[PDB]
């Protein structure tokens, strides 16, 4: 965009980063879950992977400042999560160091870049800062003891008549994708823009709610073999899974250390996808494709075209959709009627990512970015295990790297990441 700009958005991430590592340096070197890495190491990963993208054009054979062999121990491909916490990792003092070094050079060749020159990785860079974030934000969450983080800011509140009820997204072509002309900061996995035919169906106008999920709870659903796959069950088995992660014995739920009521009405947050589609099943649903998911968040029928956000074309707002990580928790069902999309599905962005059935597949036409093995690893058969794909965001994100094309995924167990469930059906 403007230089400018890009520059406000690696200092609004920075300064994000920055807010999630002000604590103590015993808190920054804990393994909160072996999930999760200490946050020591999301904040080194982040300055190394910007100085790798930026100021290396991507070649790791480039000189870096950190020696080759200390630099490695921040690739996240050869160091699997739970071993992290015993390496032996640059402390608090010489990560910061780092980060800021790297960043001064960073913003120094952004202003020296030609006129009209590609840019394309500076906001790559944004949007991995801001994933590492939400990342550090799932390891605050899973942290037991006393809160670190206050409570988050206010939300509207939701209102009657949303939850439960479906629209339906009539049938025929849409445009899947989008192409850099359109969104010049794309990552490579939403492009490029091509056309699906999707037959009709209907979607959740709403997430599901915990007041729901609590039903399902009641009626057995995790007792019930026949509403989950053969997968799901073994591992709801194996995990002792009997309700979404930190909802307690007690009825309370804990959020971000917080011991609070669990709200009735907001969406459902921290199940599996395997919980995820026994709900919908025993809902008499199923889950959406990712393809119908980003049909229900962009089509609108009435002119046959794309939106760049569900409600259009206007910037994310406060009073749009619940984004950027203040709130810390999503918001009630109904609380954001302007940020419908065309066929009235409302929380599309923001508030939970939402699990769809699609594992991760390439669009026809494909290419990777500078980071090639940012997508192309993970899709199917690949042979890096088995993913499904989440869409549309949770509170957490920012909105400046969000859009309904956007595709996040993980491994069908995890459940620490801020993800609820939408239901869809078949029309006949
Ligand atoms: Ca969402
Ligand atoms: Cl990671
Ligand atoms: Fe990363
Ligand atoms: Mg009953």
Redesign the pocket.
């Known amino acids: 965009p403007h230089r400018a700009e890009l520059a406000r958005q690696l200092i609004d991430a920075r300064n994000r980063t920055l807010r999630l590592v002000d604590f103590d340096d015993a808190e920054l070197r804990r393994q909160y879950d072996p999930l999760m890495?200490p946050l020591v190491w999301?904040l080194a990963?982040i300055g190394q992977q910007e100085e790798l993208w930026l100021l290396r054009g991507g070649d790791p054979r480039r000189p870096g400042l950190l020696e080759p062999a200390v630099e490695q121990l921040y690739d996240?491909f050869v160091h699997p999560?739970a071993s992290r916490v015993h390496l032996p990792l640059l402390s608090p003092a010489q990560a910061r160091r780092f980060c800021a070094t790297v960043r001064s050079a960073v913003l120094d060749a952004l202003d020296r870049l030609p006129e009209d020159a590609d840019t394309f990785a500076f906001g790559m860079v944004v949007s991995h800062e801001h994933q590492?974030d939400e990342?550090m934000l799932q390891a605050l969450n899973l942290r037991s003891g006393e809160p670190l983080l206050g409570s988050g800011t206010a939300l509207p509140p939701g209102r009657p008549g949303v939850a439960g009820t479906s629209v339906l997204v009539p049938g025929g072509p849409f445009v899947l994708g989008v192409d850099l002309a359109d969104e010049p900061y794309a990552l490579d996995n939403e492009r490029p823009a091509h056309v699906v035919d999707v037959p009709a169906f209907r979607i959740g106008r709403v997430p599901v709610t915990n007041a729901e999920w609590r039903a399902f709870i009641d009626d057995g659903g995790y007792r019930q073999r026949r509403w989950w796959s053969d997968a799901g069950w073994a591992y709801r088995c194996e995990a002792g899974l009997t309700a979404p992660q930190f909802w307690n014995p007690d009825g309370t739920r804990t959020r971000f250390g917080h011991v609070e009521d669990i709200p009735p009405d907001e969406p459902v947050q921290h199940v599996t996808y395997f919980e995820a589609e026994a709900y919908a099943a025993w809902a008499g649903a199923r889950l959406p494709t990712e393809i119908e998911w980003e049909k229900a968040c962009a089509w609108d029928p009435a002119t046959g075209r794309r939106r760049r956000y569900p409600w259009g074309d206007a910037a994310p707002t406060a009073a749009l959709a619940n984004l950027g990580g203040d709130a810390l928790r999503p918001a009630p069902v109904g609380a954001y009627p302007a940020g419908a999309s065309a066929c009235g599905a409302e929380q599309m962005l923001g508030d939970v990512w939402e699990w769809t059935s699609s594992p991760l597949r390439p669009w026809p036409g494909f290419t990777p970015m500078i980071y090639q093995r940012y997508s192309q690893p993970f899709f199917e058969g690949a042979g890096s295990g088995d993913y499904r794909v989440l869409r549309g965001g949770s509170w957490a994100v920012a909105a400046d790297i969000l859009r309904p094309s956007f595709r996040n995924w993980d491994h069908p167990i995890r459940r620490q990441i801020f993800a609820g469930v939408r239901l869809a059906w078949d029309v006949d």
Request: glycine share 0%.
């Open positions: 890495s999301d990963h996240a999560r590492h990342t």
